[PDB]
Design a protein around this nucleic acid. Structure first.
Lengths: 124, 138
RNA sequence: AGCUAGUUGGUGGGGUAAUGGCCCACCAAGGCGACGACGGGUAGCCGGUCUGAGAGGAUGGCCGGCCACAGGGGCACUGAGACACGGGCCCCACUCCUACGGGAGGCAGCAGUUAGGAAUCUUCCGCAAUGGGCGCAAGCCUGACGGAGCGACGCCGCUUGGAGGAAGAAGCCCUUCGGGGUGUAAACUCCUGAACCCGGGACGAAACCCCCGACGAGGGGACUGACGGUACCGGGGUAAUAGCGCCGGCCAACUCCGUGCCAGCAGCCGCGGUAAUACGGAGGGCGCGAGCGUUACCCGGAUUCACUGGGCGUAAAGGGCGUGUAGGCGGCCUGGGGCGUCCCAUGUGAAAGACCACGGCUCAACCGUGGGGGAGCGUGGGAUACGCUCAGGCUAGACGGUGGGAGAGGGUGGUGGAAUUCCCGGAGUAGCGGUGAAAUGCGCAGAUACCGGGAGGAACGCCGAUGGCGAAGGCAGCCACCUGGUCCACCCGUGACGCUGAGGCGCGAAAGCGUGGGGAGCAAACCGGAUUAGAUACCCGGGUAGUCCACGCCCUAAACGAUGCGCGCUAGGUCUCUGGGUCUCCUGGGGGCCGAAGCUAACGCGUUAAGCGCGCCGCCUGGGGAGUACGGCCGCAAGGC
RNA sequence: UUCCCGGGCCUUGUACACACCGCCCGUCACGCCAUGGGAGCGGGCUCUACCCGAAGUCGCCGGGAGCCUACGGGCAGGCGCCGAGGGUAGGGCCCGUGACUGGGGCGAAGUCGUAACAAGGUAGCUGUACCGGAAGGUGCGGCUGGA
RNA sequence: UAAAAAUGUUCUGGAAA
């Protein structure tokens, strides 16, 4: 466009949209699972992913994913939302953080334990 | 009605140089001759010369090329490789003496219009003046 | 998208340290707005900070400057200064006391509590220093400040040892059961000595003050250390923590077992369905280390809003077309001004930070001293090429004049023949019509086919196109009248009068809408026949809007060259329409095809550019949601923007 | 050698390439999700006019009323203007919510058909209009991105 | 340029390489 047309209209900044409204960007956000079920994934893949539907301190009720194998969440377990989406679950855009509040670490995990609560076993 | 005499002149040169024309005609303007004088001194053209086409004042620029070459396409190398108008009416460009551009690491030249006359980058720098930046040629 | 009554200005007042509608009478009607007023949202601004090659982008926490506020709110008093954080008056909400009539408070000062939260510290020591208030002074006050505490929150320094030590222990893992790996790693040998122990132990503190000299200069004297019995130094001195991520490709790092589209992984592409370097464990490896990962947010990469530095024929992107307002932009020669612009000087540009040099803590991180940048804007001086301005001069752009030209360009009236339908009159008889085949239908109440006459509506065969005209939509018998564009020739007149164009205004196929008129043929809808599994379709028979005219609306399109308007420049060959020619052919305007150079992802475009350039406008930033919703404007509606 | 089956070679169209035993369109039904409309309901902010109007400066009075001194005056005290806030009423902006309702996106193996892609079996696309369970069909005009 | 010619439907989800 003509310089004159830039002088008049000028350019336009992009403005990025957040993939995670956990308000204040808040690295995380606390909440309570009001529904803790298992959804069937998107396509290529088949499975029974375990997802909790949690009510938040942001004033939002979102559905999040419970990473790892085997979890201990019930209809009222307080939980810490982390934000990180799941490709197959059309709805889930956040990950429940293992090892915080009612969320138990992953029993017997031995690799990447840091990413799953699961403390550290004593070589005993 | 032609909106930029100079721009046009630079273009007419470009156009014929690229089709290995012996010379090209361009409408006469005192300011334009200046440019041409510089284009000749720094060696880009063989020379210009006020002449008259159909009763009107024109400038006949004489182009300069390189020697013929081998392989396919023997079209010679070009002396005027690039030649782009910097300051146009749609947006003028003035440069402080410190701001003067260095064209092609030195193997090229910009042409300024200063309060001391239409001089080249070196001439302008030495004279410590700055100005409107007509074009650059390499 | 319009806003404004103290509103805009005036005169005389009040007010103030002072200008001023700051406030007030009176007067005048003003002020402001697409260069975005009014309004809505968000936000304290800066030095700087992060990022970036840079231009930029993001940001404004610590430290420094300015502003503002002190539970919410209004006001004044004292005073050099406040309409006053720990002063006052009052209202309010809240919390507390009360001998119930009145009293009390305001941590956004330092510590600390609770709430909220993913999350943010001690009710610490000292005025020893620096700084402040008051005092002649001694000195008093000082949660400013100097320290200490807590938290890997960050940066930097350091440790968990060093040198020997096997064709190589064990254990664990692989294996073509020879062996290979973890691995000089361990064990084992010497060697140093983080911690801790004993002794010593700071700088930061020299003047206030005192004495000689005058309470001046200068010299001497005394008191004073929170951190601390800390740093640091001397001697003694024990082998003394290791974890986190990752190993399919991007990307450094591979094997065995388990599982079997399960359990699970996943930043992108994607891994898993009985032999998975991708899931989970192990061995092994790679990376980094008191750390290592994860999430959130900023810049980069992203020339992916492109100033630097992009685009629009087919990928997103040319506005349906005109006319034109504001705006932007502007030919050739000369002179005056010197706003733009450029040059010198000079003021300013605090500090810290950043950079560089050198220094101080054993180094570094921190820290000091010095050095160098700096556009911007003020002032004075100077230059005049280009832009600008005034002025004079020109004719190459543009417009005009005269003489001519082609044309379905437009409006209005009139009118000619072919054909269809219907009606009347002849004449004639058994079917016609229609399809893939048929049937409905029409017909012996006389159709079809034939001849004659009539009415009426709509469209114009041949010419006729690869043609012409128009800004587009679009325009086709013939005649006349009114009228637009446009081209050639002569170069006669004006003398830059030019290009473009947000808005505005005008036009704008078909369908569609409102009055009334018109209605032959055609034909959505609708009814039959047939086809078919069905047939709301294709085929057949009927048929109403409509199609036609007038006046007024509607404003869309594959409104297309999917290609905006203008000007300059850059090989040719060929066919064609229209003009002029010294009619071999040249030259002007237009319509095509092929192709120089060049351009393009390619296809292709190529003097009718999609090439090489300048000016102005429109428009595009992944797909879907969606040209949808909400809002506004428009319309009778349908809907349009 | 028309046709039916399989196949050579050239050519043309293609949205096919798991390669026509291909691709693919719309309704219906089922679930999650965000969103428009909706009797109306609950709010936040904001504007106008009116009534009540504290403190306080300011302007009059300062009297048949008190007190001062540095008493020509001053102070207390009274009246008024303005005024925080409160109150009645009506507008504007935005947010939440609402029986029911509209379409939208997404969702391994549902239902109906067959619109499109090869004269996709009626060339396709298109603006409009009427019609139809659905894709879509037909009318009028336009395009070639069809022969 | 002008441009004739076909009544007749359909093929679950992943993965092929």
């Amino acid at each position: 466009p003509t310089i004159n047309q830039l002088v008049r209209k000028g350019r336009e900044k992009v403005r990025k949209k957040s993939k995670v409204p956990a308000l204040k960007g808040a690295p995380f956000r606390r909440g309570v699972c009001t529904v803790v079920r298992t959804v069937t994934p998107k396509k290529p893949n088949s499975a029974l992913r375990k997802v909790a539907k949690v009510r938040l301190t942001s004033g939002y009720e979102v559905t999040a994913y419970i990473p790892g194998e085997g979890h201990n969440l019930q209809e009222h377990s307080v939980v810490l939302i982390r934000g990180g989406r799941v490709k197959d679950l059309p709805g889930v855009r956040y990950h429940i953080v293992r090892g915080v509040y009612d969320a138990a670490g992953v029993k017997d995990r031995k690799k990447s334990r840091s990413k799953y609560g699961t403390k550290k076993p004593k070589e005993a | 009605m032609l909106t930029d005499p100079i721009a046009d002149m630079l273009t007419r040169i470009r156009n014929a140089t690229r089709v290995y024309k012996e010379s090209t005609d361009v409408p006469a303007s005192r300011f334009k001759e200046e440019i041409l004088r510089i284009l000749a001194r720094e060696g880009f053209i063989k020379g210009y010369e006020r002449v008259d086409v159909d009763g009107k004042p024109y400038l006949r620029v004489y182009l300069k090329y390189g020697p013929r070459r081998q392989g396919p396409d023997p079209r010679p190398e070009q002396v005027i490789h690039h030649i782009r108008r910097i300051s146009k009416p749609g947006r003028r460009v003035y440069v402080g003496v410190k701001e003067i551009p260095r064209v092609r690491r030195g193997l090229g030249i910009a042409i300024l219009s200063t309060s001391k006359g239409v001089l080249t980058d070196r001439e302008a720098r030495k004279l410590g003046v700055g100005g409107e930046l007509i074009c650059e040629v390499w």
